[PDB]
Design a protein. Sequence first.
Lengths: 74, 57, 79, 55, 69, 97, 126
Amino acid sequence: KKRKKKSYTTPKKNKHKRKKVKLAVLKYYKVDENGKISRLRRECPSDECGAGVFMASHFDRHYCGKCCLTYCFN
Amino acid sequence: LRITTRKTPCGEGSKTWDRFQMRIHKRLIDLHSPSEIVKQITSISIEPGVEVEVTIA
Amino acid sequence: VQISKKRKFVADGIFKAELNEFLTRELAEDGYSGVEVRVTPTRTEIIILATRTQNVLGEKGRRIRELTAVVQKRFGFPE
Amino acid sequence: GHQQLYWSHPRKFGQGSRSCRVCSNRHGLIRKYGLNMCRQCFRQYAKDIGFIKLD
Amino acid sequence: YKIPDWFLNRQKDVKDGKYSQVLANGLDNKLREDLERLKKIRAHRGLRHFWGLRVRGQHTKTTGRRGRT
Amino acid sequence: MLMPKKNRIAIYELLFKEGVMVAKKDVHMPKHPELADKNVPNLHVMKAMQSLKSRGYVKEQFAWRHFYWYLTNEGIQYLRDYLHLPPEIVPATLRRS
Amino acid sequence: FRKFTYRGVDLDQLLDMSYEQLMQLYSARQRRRLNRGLRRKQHSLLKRLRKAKKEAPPMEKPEVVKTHLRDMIILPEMVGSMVGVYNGKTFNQVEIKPEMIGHYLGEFSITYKPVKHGRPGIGATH
RNA sequence: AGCGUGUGCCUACCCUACGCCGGCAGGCGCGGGUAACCCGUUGUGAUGGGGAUCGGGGAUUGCAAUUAUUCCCCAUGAACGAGGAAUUCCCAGUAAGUGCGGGUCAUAAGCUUGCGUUGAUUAAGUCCCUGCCCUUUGUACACACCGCCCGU
RNA sequence: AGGAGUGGAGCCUGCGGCUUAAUUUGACUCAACACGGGAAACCUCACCCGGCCCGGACACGGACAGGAUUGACAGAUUGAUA
């Protein structure tokens, strides 16, 4: 009988905290400064989601999680 | 309904077992009578334990 | 819906044993002695023996009503 | 997310699906005739269930 | 004649889907253990067979000491 | 823990309409014997019951893998003080006297 | 020299055909594991094998892949493709041949290390 | 011939009878059973004789079994005819040979708990070994002989 | 001076000797040694090459619309569609 000896790797880890900005500069912008503004995201034509569902952007496969929709040309 | 179980709660001692028995007796009686007679003879303040299942078939 | 007669009798014994233990840990201070169930057509009358009864009923049967409510909502009998 | 993990491969011999109905003990279960106790608990209550030592 | 062909020694063997005939003594014993291909593939079963020990895994530490006597 | 607050007010409605209850430890399951079909997830509801009866002011009694509770009038006063629902709404349990 | 055949028949033509008569001229040992069926988490080993196959210049040893998949391969089309598996505390790689039906990946690991002999004394020597 | 087991408070896991047919459990349908109702009237001795590793036939469907689940046929030949010191159990339906059913559980046993079938050579004794008890006796032991205790 | 079956010839497991991730709790002879009804992947493994969501009716401290909760294959992870 001995110990478990979970000691060789990772003696201490620091928590992963997201530097989420309180100001919507990276998230949304108007670039117009007017009452009527344009939106920098593609209109979703799917009717399995809501009418206010806006997707973000990555290098590909805009990862919504709920639907896993990826734009492909068939 | 035999059930054999080790006597010692731990695993120490001579291997000793309790042999428990549960003996269930069952009897059937056949007759010809309408339902009212059967349900009038059933409610006779039966002594405990004698479960009754009355069937029509 | 229907279970085998050996299982039925074992379950009835389990009913009796757990009811006895439950009202032993409930009202041992009431001088409880034993509990007996009575076979009745499509009903299960239960008669409980205690040295003192004025305490087990109490005032207007608060203890009795509490016990019947908990036993009903525990055992799954019809209302 | 939750449904992405649960119910992936059926556990048809799940030991943890049973426990002693009196003290919640994992070992020595008595599932015969539906007692579903650790054998110690059964010995404690065997006379009350109806099981008796006759032989 | 379509007779049930489960009366021959080595069936469904590699290198021939048909049951070819052979003869002579000192030659059946070798072919009862076609260990060449499994030795080649660097498998543990080849050296299980080779040492004369247990391929399926017969327990040998208190029982099963025969095989060399 | 890891308990939401809408589930908290739902379980408080359940305690107000219920009061006296018997419970069985069931967490990992998706289907309970006698406390399912509440349109609310079972795990958080049972942990809500755990909070109620282990906050340190209402005593418990556990045996035969079951929970029987003695809801003290201190709990009645606590619920009245927090949720501010007058006790003039008598519980429906006081029929069939 | 000519390429060594598998049970006297080729593989590519039988791969282009369905499974209706695939087992009529096969050996046991994966006799029914081929027929057991399919579940999730099976195209993983095939996918990484195809990745190592495509990204490797021809007539060269590929990169070492890390996996523990003790699985079955329904298609022997991967002649020339090899699987490396974590064994013990390191990797291990095993020669592949056209003969895949008749064996399993898990049948190549040696774990029964020879008894490290001791010199017991003090106690019961007699 | 079993003694016995067998399907919802849990719970999603119960025991099982004909056809695709290579030679049968059986990959899919198919009904019965809360059970006395269904499973189920469950030529003189290594030769032919009891198997040393180990290979094919359709595999029961258990991710993995090999880091324990899964059939018999080709007769390829193993000290092939009462066993170091030390030895455990047993006196009649004993022992032993067998299989079968439960507990474990996925019909998971090589374990255990029971059950039958075949079935009996030896002893109806003694205190020799180990140990026990209805006596007397001795003691410096009483932590009780695995004691106490003497000697540079 | 009896005997039969004996542990040796046909179906593996208990725990100590016993390299590291292998010899993993309690049981020091009859009264431990398929015994904990304990048939070891895994939920039961504490010898285990590895991690995580964490536990406070209170005594003291950090101070609110963000101080992160199992929750993406393809550059990878130390088997793992974590």
